[PDB]
Write a protein that binds this DNA or RNA. Sequence first.
RNA 1: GUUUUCAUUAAUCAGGAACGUAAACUAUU
RNA 2: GAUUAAUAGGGACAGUCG
Lengths: 159, 58, 347, 126, 49, 48, 31, 66
Amino acid sequence: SRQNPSDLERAIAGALYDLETNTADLKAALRPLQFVSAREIEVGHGKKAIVIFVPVPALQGFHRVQQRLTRELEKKFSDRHVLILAARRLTAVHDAILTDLVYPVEIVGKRLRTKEDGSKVLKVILDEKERGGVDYRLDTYSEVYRRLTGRNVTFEFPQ
Amino acid sequence: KYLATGLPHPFESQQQYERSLRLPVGPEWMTKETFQDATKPRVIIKQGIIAPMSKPMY
Amino acid sequence: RMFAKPFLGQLGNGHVQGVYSMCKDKNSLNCIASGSGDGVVKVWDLTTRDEETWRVAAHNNIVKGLTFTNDKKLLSCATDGIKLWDPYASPSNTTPIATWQEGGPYTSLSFHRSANTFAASSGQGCIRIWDLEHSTAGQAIQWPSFVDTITDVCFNQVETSVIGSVATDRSIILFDLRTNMPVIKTVLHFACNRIVFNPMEAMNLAVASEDHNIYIFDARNFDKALNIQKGHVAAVMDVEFSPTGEELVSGSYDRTIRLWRRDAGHSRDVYHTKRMQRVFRTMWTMDSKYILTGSDDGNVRLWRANASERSGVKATRQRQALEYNNALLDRYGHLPEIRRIRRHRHL
Amino acid sequence: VRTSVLHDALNSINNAEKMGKRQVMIRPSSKVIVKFLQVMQRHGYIGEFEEVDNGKIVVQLNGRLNKCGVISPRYNVRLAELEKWVTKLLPARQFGYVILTTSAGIMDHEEARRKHVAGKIIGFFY
Amino acid sequence: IGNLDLRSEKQRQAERDLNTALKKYLRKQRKKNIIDEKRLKAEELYRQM
Amino acid sequence: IIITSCVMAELEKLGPRYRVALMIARDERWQRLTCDHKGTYADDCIVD
Amino acid sequence: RPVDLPAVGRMRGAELRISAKEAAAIAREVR
Amino acid sequence: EDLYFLIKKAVAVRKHLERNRKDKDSKFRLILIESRIHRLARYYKTVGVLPPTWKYESSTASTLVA
RNA sequence: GUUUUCAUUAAUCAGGAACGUAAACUAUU
RNA sequence: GAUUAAUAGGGACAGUCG
Ligand SMILES: [Zn+2]
C-alpha cells in the first residue's frame, strides 16, 4: 500500500488480522484489507482517539458492517474512541470528510452563522432519530475534524 | 348595569364576595381611625434611593 | 382618566441617531447615560435636563451595552470592544482610561452591586468577568460547547455572585460566580431579548422575549413560568423591574411602553407618542416614580408611572382623597361602567 | 424573472425594514449577497445573519437601515468620479455607503478611499 | 350595587367549562307546527311510554 | 443656522419615512432654540 | 415625494436603473 | 428519451387527428407539441447527440413507427 | 404523489402562424 | 476524464379530476 509500520500501525493491523479467526463468524471486508494507515493525535486532555484511513471503495465496504466492529475495536483495543475515515489528498473533499466522519447518523444542515463583526462560526446539525450514543463522541468529532482540516466546526443536535 | 357580571378573580363564592364587601369605606360611615387604617395603601413608597435589599430581613 | 397626563419631558436635544443603549447609576439618583447608534455616548444629569453633562464620540458602530461603575466611571461596549471613561472630572477628558478588545465581539455589560467586578456578555457564547484594578483579561465563563451569542447579561443585585444571561439559542443560562461555571440552561420556544432580576425577591427573573411576552420565572424551579405578561403587538425589546420590585416597564418594538404590576398578567398602562419612533431601552429612576425611554428617534424621554398621581408634598386632605379614591377603585373596579372607563385608553 | 438574485434579496430586506419585521428568509443565496451583508454588518445596519442549507439566509436586522438598492448597469468608476457618485447617490456624505466591486474585493467607499482602489458601483445602502 | 348577576355568572361558567311534563311538552309543541327533531325524540319517548 | 423645537417637532411628527431628514436636522453643530409656548406650530413660532 | 430617493436614475423596488446618458453626465461633471 | 416520448405523443395526436379531422383543440395541442419537439431537438442538435441532418416533419414519424 | 430521468435546455416579444345585431350607469401584503 | 440537483425546466409511472 503506502506504509511501513509505526509502533501502533502493526497493532491495529494485528487487530484486523485477529478479527478473522478466534471470534465470529463474520468477515466480509476483513480478509480483502491490508495495512492501510492510522493516526494517534489527542482529543481533549488526557484522552486520545484513533483514526484509521481506508481505501475509497472500502468505505462503502465498511458501511456494510460497522455495528459491533467499532464496539470490539473500542473494547479490545486501548479503550479510546475508534474512528474510520477515507484517505484523500477542496470544499467537496472537506464535505466528504464530514459525511464520512459521522458514520451512523446523517447530517442534515450546515449553518454558517456570522457574528456582529467579520468572525464566523460553522455549525453542522445532525439527525434527531439517533441522539443518545453520539453526544459524548461529538467533541471527538469536532476535534478530529479540526486536527485533519483546520476549520473549527461544532456539532450539535437540533432542538 | 350596577350588578356585577361575574365573580372577581380571587373569590370563589357569591356569598363570599357579596358578603366580603359589606362595609362602606368612606368617612361618613366609619370613624377617622378606621378610615385611615382602611385606606392606607399596601406599598408605601417614600422618597429616596430605593436600593435592592442588602441582607435578609427575616 | 382626565388627569392621566404621563409625559413629563425629554432629556436635552437628544441624540442624532437612535438610542440603542442606556444605563442609570444605581448608587446616585440623577446620573443617566445613553449611547446612540452613531457611537456617541452622553452622560445626563436629571436635575438639569436642558443640556448634557458629558459627551464623547465613543466608538465606530452602535453602542450595544453601557453601564456605570460603582466608583464614578462608566463603561461602554461596542463591536470595537469595551472602554472605560471618567465622565466626572475637573477637566473633561474625551479619551478613555482603559480599553479591552480581546474576547470576541461584546454585546452587553452588567456591573456588580458592591465590588468593582463586572461581566461582559460577548458574542463567542461566553461571558467574561473582570475585577477592576487587578485584572486585565478577565475570566471567561462559558457553557462547555456553546456557539450562539449571549445577548444580555445581568448581575443579580440582591443575591450577589449569581449571573443570568439569555442567548439566541432561545435559551436562558445561569452562572454562579463563586464556583466559576454555568449552572442551568433552559430552552424556551422563542428568542429572549433581555433578562432582568427582581430587586426585592432574589430568585425571580423576567425575560422579555420575541413571543411578544414577558415571562416571570423562578430561578430555583425552571419548570414553569411564575407569570406570563401578554399585552404586546411587536416584540418586547426591554424589560425593567421597579426598584420596589412590584412593577415592570417594557419597551416594545412597536411604539409602546407598557406598565405592569407584578401579579397582573395584563397592562396597567400603555404609553405612546407619534414622535416616538421605536422603543429600545426603558428603565426606572431610583425613585420608582418616573421611567425613562430611549427610543429610535434619538430621544430619551422621561415619563411617569402612576400617570394621574402628581408628585411633591401633599396636604393631608389631598393625599387622603387620593388614597380614598384608590381604595374605592380597588373595591368597585370590576363593575361594568367603572370597568369600561378605567380600561379605555387611546392606542 | 429577475436574474439579479442580489436585487431579490435587497427587495426582501427593504420589505422587512418597512414592515418592521426582525428577520427574513432570503430564499436564493449567493456569495455576492453574503459579501453585501458583510459590508452592511460591518457598518452595523444588520445584526447577524446565517446561511443555512437545504440554501437560504436568515438575516437578523436591528431596525436601523432605511433603503437598500442595486445599481443595475454596474457602471465603472474612478476615485475622482467616486466622490461625485457618492454625493449624487447618498442623501448625505456622512449617511450611508456605496458598495464597490473592486480588485481588492467588495467594500464600501470609505474602505476604497483607504485602500486606494477604484471599481464598479454595484449597490448602496443608507 | 356590586351583587352577582346570577344568570351572567352561570353563562360565564358554562362558556368556561365547555312522565307528567313530557305530555304537556307535546301539547305546547303541537301548536307551532314546527317539527323540530327534539319533538321527534319526544314522540318516540311517548310511544315507548 | 438655527432650528426651533417646533421645527424639530414637526419633523418628528412626520413618520419614519423622513428619518434621514430628521438626522440631517439633528446634526450636532447647529443651535437649538428652545421654545416656550404650547401648540408646536412652526409658522406661528417663527413669526412670533 | 419621498425624500430618500436618489437623484441620478429611476428606482423600481430595490433596482435602480441608470440610463447611459446619466453615467456620462456624471463623468462630464467630474471633468 | 424525452424526444422519443415527445415524438410518440406527436404521432398519437396526428393519428387521432387524421381519424377525426373536425376538432381544433387537438390541432392546437399538436402545434404546442411540435414547437416543444423542435425546441428540444434544437438543444440536442447544439449539443450534438443526434445527427445535424436528422429532421422530423412527418416522414421521420412515419419511419419511426415503421 | 413517487424509492423518476438529459442538466441549461430557459424568460420576453420585431417578422409571422393556429383558433373568433351590439353598447347604454360603472418580494411580500 | 462527469459540481450543486435549482425554492426555473421538459419527460416517465400510479391513483385520479373535469
Ligand atoms: Zn416654538
